[PDB]
Point group: D4
Chain length 140, copies 8
């Protein structure tokens, strides 16, 4: 996308309430345009949706963990949807890294991680290895 | 946080434009409350900010890559801030996984990945190993 | 063999329809030394065959993957054979590396790669693990 | 493209001097449909070239090795380029796997392999590590 | 807590029968400040218990081993519990490292270590893999 | 040694201030058999010392980490010695595992752990790599 | 052992036919002594036996391979004795390295290795991973 | 080699003092032949030499260790000869396994291993990683 639309996504991704009117003065173009642009990005799908960036330490989620999930080859997708279903898997990927599954989980402590691993993820038919990697700090 | 505030963050994280008024009818409480709550989460920091969820395939970023960055122990933080500075490092972590640095990079193709790796990340004073793991699909 | 063979061999891997006369003037040798040479090369199995260098990129295969395939030790030769049957498996090795079965897979995209692994390789009986390394550029 | 292309492509990788007439009667299509087809294939870069399948075993290369080459991150593109210059490096990749540089090396024997690693690859400046996996059989 | 606690704590891990008076003259504080301090330490669970540092070497245990124990994900908590029952398992962790179960095992010799792995750990149901790292010297 | 020693040893690791009389009635042996036993145990170095089991969790150390420390081979004994000097290093080993130096580190939180690695361990000269595995629960 | 007996084993290990008489003049002692010594080492077991050092390349065993053999923990010893039984396992160890079993196998070629692996070692009830590492050259 | 010569090497490798005369009656052939054969194997090089199989536990060498030695690619052979020179490297190989060097070292204890590693092998110009794997038991 155009340069203008690139700037507009930069800006919105920093504060998605920036009012159109502010974008327009940022770009030298006008509201209607900033409007039009925004909608068009939205209709296209570049803007999937309007969301919120939520802080895990302040919700008490002290161990944001990147968890690997190995699987019997044959049950990759069956595991993946049941990991999809748990509310502590805050985002799920198929990867070409060491483990195909790759969950960004939020546990609140070692015993919560250890609990989740074994009682929730460890018990999914098909799961052959959970490999949790705890995030020391988020930098960007 | 309270259960009500948990629901309110669920909802907002699904569409952070849901109007207060809709939250209120969702919870059986009232606008003012949904208002008050929201602000309070915001002032607290549970709501870091209002943002946008942007689709890499439709921006032409076909290889969303989880890149490991090894470093000389002594230059961890110096590497980390220069990786922080590049606009293709869409999020940066310190981890207890195989590589301390852990960048979620967006390249547009193998040659873009290979370019970025070696010409941009590979040349940061201190970087001793880039380990890129390409995301086959995002599931959540 | 001899130097002119290695050169003839070099030339022929480059352009297999290279005229014998241009081979000839290059080596500074009759077309009929060439011709004779080409055919002992062919005779002895040194040239085992004439084929076409095909570009995956132009054919929709943007993801050339080196997939290691781990397997139940009983079944290494079964899984190889179910793997060679498939058209995505472009070349297939029994190797001493980290995985006994090594395949060069051509998938369209991440999704396609995700799909081949999970639905076609993965369900082969005896496959204990698929390990894809995506190739970024081919340099020779 | 279309099925007859994929088949023509199949046939041509098998025996590149396959008569167009046999291609033709097989697809059940004129020699001149074939001929036209072959040349849009050639035109579009799908057939990028005619070459010879050469057997290392008969040429004294009994050790076909997949050598991963680790390297100082600064110098990944230098080391690739000093590597492609050499004749033992039969094919050379920039890959996402455990090692950025991946080469298919043909050495005569263990000793020869030991020798190429230590004396020719190893001394290339910037090579931090050579990782050879010897191939046992080639199956496709 | 406070510095004198950390020091009292230091002293007490060194010689747990250190007189309170020597603690006392060292910190330059009454025996009865000490005494009070020791017991809020004891009260709050900071001192959780008095025990003996035992030397494996003099007890015939010349092989202090850190044994990672891999396991079927279903059964991580079963295998831990069958492991803690045994006397060779001196300390037992649920860790985020390469293996979820981590034990500090004391075997007499290689043979004994071979034996514990194969006959006692190994047969525990659900153990998919034992990974022993023998400790060479203990330095603190 | 003998069974009553192993039991006395068991009892004493449990509660080191266990009365000799309760040891005694348990083994069914004089206080003065006990007393004698305890002191040959002490004499021979089997009991090498009396210390306190200290709980990191209550002391603010919520992150008990097993940190492998890789190092320039020249400097393995230097780096160990600069490591034992530090108070976060609670126990320190020279081990046969994946890393020669193995330390049990107590950091407050992820950040603190990030900090110790980068600022205190990492800058030790000769440290080529820090490898932290966070412990989730301690079970014995 | 004594210094004299150390020298005598050095010498014998270089040529175990060196006649006693030559040892004696080597040491300044006498035949009878060199005799006595030798016998005593033999009776003790320091000299397990008199054997021959046999060259694998000249027997046509071009791939002397250090093979890892993973196993279900429970069937370690059952695998080990059946690997013991094959005549191509020229020496078998239990190790604390990556794989407990560790065979020094002699195959004659990649296809022999690949054959042995899968048809002989790969089919032992219990074997979960063969990891062959080919010796490029023997240096001592 | 012939079947007869295979048997003769089996036999000799079990006791290389078996007198010719015993081989001959074992094979049904005659002394002179068994003679002739033996010499011919010797002159050929299949019999490199006559040696002794020496027991490390009874010499007090309790940790027979398979040590990996990583190296800067460029200094492979320079390291290898200095490892060749130490009397505790009882046999040295170049490998295609994880580490090119591969020493079978005999230390007498953890502190001897740890000493050797760091003071002797760790200090060889060029050595970038020692990876010792202790043999629990020898089975063949």
């Amino acid at each position: 996308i155009d340069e203008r639309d690139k700037i507009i996504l930069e800006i919105l991704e920093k504060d998605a309430r920036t009012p159109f009117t502010e974008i327009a003065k940022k770009l030298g173009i006008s509201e209607t345009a900033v409007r039009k642009r925004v909608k068009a990005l939205e209709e296209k799908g570049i803007i999937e949706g309007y969301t919120i960036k939520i802080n895990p330490k302040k919700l008490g989620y002290s161990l944001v963990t990147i968890t690997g999930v190995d699987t019997k080859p044959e049950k990759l997708f069956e595991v993946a949807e049941k990991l999809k279903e748990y509310d502590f898997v805050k985002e799920l990927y198929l990867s070409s890294g060491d483990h195909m599954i790759m969950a960004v989980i939020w546990a609140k402590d070692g015993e919560d991680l250890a609990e989740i691993i074994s009682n929730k993820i460890g018990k999914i038919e098909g799961v052959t290895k959970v490999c949790p990697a705890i995030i020391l700090e988020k930098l960007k």
